[PDB]
Amino acid sequence: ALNRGDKVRIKRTESYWYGDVGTVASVEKSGILYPVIVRFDRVNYNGFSGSASGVNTNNFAENELELVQAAAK
């Protein structure tokens, strides 16, 4: 497994972040049932539909995530 900072690439298909990366803020709190909480710079800032400070941290399934950042402490 990776680390907390080890920027993984979101390869879902059914997502607004398809072909994008983010920061894996997982292996701190997401020692549970779904493994990987990642960062998103595009959380859809349309304030009267969703919000401007909504879902930046979201939990994935690793099958749809490949490693990019050598963030080993």
Q: Please, which residues have CB within 8 angstroms of residue 54's CB and are 6 or more apart in sequence?
A: 43, 44
44 backbone φψ class: left, alpha, beta (φ>0; ψ -120 to 50):
left
Cα–Cα dist 27/22, whole Å: 14
The domains of the chain are located at 1-73
If phi over 0 gives left and psi between -120 and 50 gives alpha, with beta otherwise, what is residue 3? beta
Contact 32, 7 (CB under 8 A): no
33: number of Cβ within 10 Å:
6
Method in brief: NMR
Contact predicate 66/9, CB 8 Å: yes
- Its CATH architecture, for the domain 1-73, is Roll (2.30)
Sequence-ordered alpha helix ranges (H) in 1-73? none
Residue 33's SS3 state is coil
